């Protein structure tokens, strides 16, 4: 069953086999059971690790329930896809991706007092053609002063770096002024509304552009693998896919007792059930009890 | 949906717009005379404004019954929609069976006739392999794992490069 | 037999979800 910390993550999720375990757990608790006390232990390394490996169990079936908008007209299918991914991140325990990757920046570079190391420690989390563009202005300012630019905020070399970093940021196509006006704010809420209605416009354009980039990459991968598949004879294709199916069945049932293997074989039996119930009556689809 | 909704018998659809099913209601003070008539069959009941707000109590929650996944069905749908585009250009192939006669055999150069018969065999290979539609369900299982690994990010499922660059400009152009 | 359910047919099948559990039930008891 569940170890009572998985069932706490599965309450907000709306995928099927998490909601089934939640409903079975509270059906057990209704018929005279006691809820276990949560462990008030397991210091923050263990807590972040099992938070990661428990949010993965909410992301992983939720990703497979989100339809890709491959080959669609407009932006609203991409907005649907990004909205489903955002609600999945909310149900998984993540916050907004702006908040989350800013937390990642503040976590990874809590000690970096140099702008060179805050560029060379967030190198995995920013685009390489923007890390290069910021290293350009970094080397330009440290060649102007012949002194290292420190990550202080009130060193004047840092401001002479940021005065060109904001220029390359608005040259990249993102309004840094509206982003800073949202993440700092003002006093009067009618001006906070006026900067939020531009920050969220940029934010929507950015996450739908990134979701459309992921969709275009999936479309190119599918087109490439189909045009590699359409060049073969049919017998080669059939024996290739039959050998792959045999290998992936062997890799499942040679290791028995593990829960993933029995779940894999229950899923292949469920696919065979789907094929049987479609072959029973193809006009009515699969037989769903109601 | 949310818990309560606020729609029904107020700024409602009063008529239908298609001919395959026609509808008329009676915009009275409290109640409604609904008249539905789709083609041959016709039904009529009466519903009140307090009865349409009782409708959204227990939610429908439509969900999809897929063979493997909704993700896998979307990738297989795109593979089928690309296979249709390849099939559409294997559909304008010129008819070679109108040049199989012996009055075309013995007028032609031997190597060009061998090329013609190999071209017909090539079309048969291409047409037998573009209509192997039972292989798309195993092709779409190769786009799934790398994509799903890309969505198992330590930051967020929906994190991109542009959002991360904007938040890095927020992280850098502030103090510390 | 046939006509199983709806909440059993809503399950995405070949998502991982259990190699994640096979790791995390053999990592967190091993890293604590």
């Amino acid at each position: 069953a569940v170890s009572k910390k998985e069932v706490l993550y599965f309450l907000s999720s709306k995928d099927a086999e998490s909601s089934t375990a939640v409903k079975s757990y509270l059906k057990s608790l209704y018929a005279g059971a006691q809820v276990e006390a949560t462990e008030t232990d397991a210091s923050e390394l263990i807590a972040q690790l099992e938070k990661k490996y428990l949010s993965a169990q909410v992301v992983e079936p939720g990703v497979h329930n989100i339809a890709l908008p491959l080959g669609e007209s407009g932006s609203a299918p991409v907005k649907r896809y990004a909205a489903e991914l955002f609600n999945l991140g909310a149900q998984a325990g993540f916050e907004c991706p702006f908040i989350e990757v800013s937390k990642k920046f503040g976590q990874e570079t809590a000690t970096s007092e140099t702008v060179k190391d805050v560029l060379n420690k967030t190198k995995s989390y920013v685009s390489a053609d923007y890390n290069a563009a910021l290293n350009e202005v970094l080397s330009s300012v440290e060649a102007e002063i012949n002194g290292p630019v420190l990550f202080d905020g009130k060193t004047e070399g840092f401001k002479k770096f940021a005065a060109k970093a904001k220029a390359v940021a608005v040259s990249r196509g993102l309004p840094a002024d509206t982003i800073l006006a949202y993440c700092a704010g003002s006093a009067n809420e009618d001006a906070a509304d006026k900067v939020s209605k531009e920050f969220f416009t940029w934010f929507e354009s950015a996450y739908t552009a990134d979701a459309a980039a992921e969709v275009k990459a999936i479309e190119a991968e599918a087109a490439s693998i189909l045009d590699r598949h359409l060049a073969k004879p049919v017998a080669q294709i059939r024996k290739e896919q039959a050998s792959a199916y045999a290998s992936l069945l062997k890799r499942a049932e040679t290791a028995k007792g593990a829960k993933w293997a029995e779940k894999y074989l229950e899923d292949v039996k469920a696919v065979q059930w789907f094929d049987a119930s479609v072959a029973e009556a193809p006009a009515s689809g699969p037989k769903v009890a109601a | 949906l949310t818990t309560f909704t606020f729609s029904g018998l107020q700024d409602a659809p009063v008529a239908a717009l298609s001919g395959s099913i026609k509808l008329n209601v009676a915009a009275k003070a409290g109640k409604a005379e609904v008249t539905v008539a789709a083609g041959a069959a016709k039904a009529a009941t009466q519903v009140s404004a307090a009865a349409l707000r009782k409708l959204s109590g227990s939610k429908i929650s439509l969900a999809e019954v897929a063979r493997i996944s909704v993700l896998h069905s979307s990738i297989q749908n795109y593979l089928l929609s690309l296979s249709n585009e390849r099939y559409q250009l294997l559909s304008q192939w010129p008819d070679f069976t109108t040049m199989y006669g012996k009055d075309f055999y013995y007028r032609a150069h031997p190597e060009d006739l061998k090329k013609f018969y190999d071209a017909a065999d090539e079309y048969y290979k291409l047409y037998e392999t573009v209509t192997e539609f039972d292989s798309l369900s195993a092709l779409a299982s190769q786009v799934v794992p790398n994509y799903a690994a890309r969505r198992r990010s330590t930051v967020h499922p929906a994190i991109g490069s542009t959002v991360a660059d904007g938040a890095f400009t927020n992280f850098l152009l502030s103090k510390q | 037999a046939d006509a199983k359910a709806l909440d059993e047919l809503r399950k995405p099948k070949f998502s991982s979800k259990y190699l994640i559990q096979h790791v995390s039930q053999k990592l967190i008891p091993a890293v604590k």
Binding site: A213 | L89, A138, P145, R150 | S16
Partner: peptide, 30 residues
């Protein structure tokens, strides 16, 4: 239709590496 089950995380944030266009359509037109 089986996919190999993976349990791994992507730590980095990368552009998703769009693959170049396959040359099948002009080859079939050829």
């Amino acid at each position: 239709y089986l996919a190999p089950l993976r349990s791994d995380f992507t730590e980095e944030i990368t552009a998703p590496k769009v693959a170049s266009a396959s040359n099948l359509v002009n080859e079939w037109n050829n």
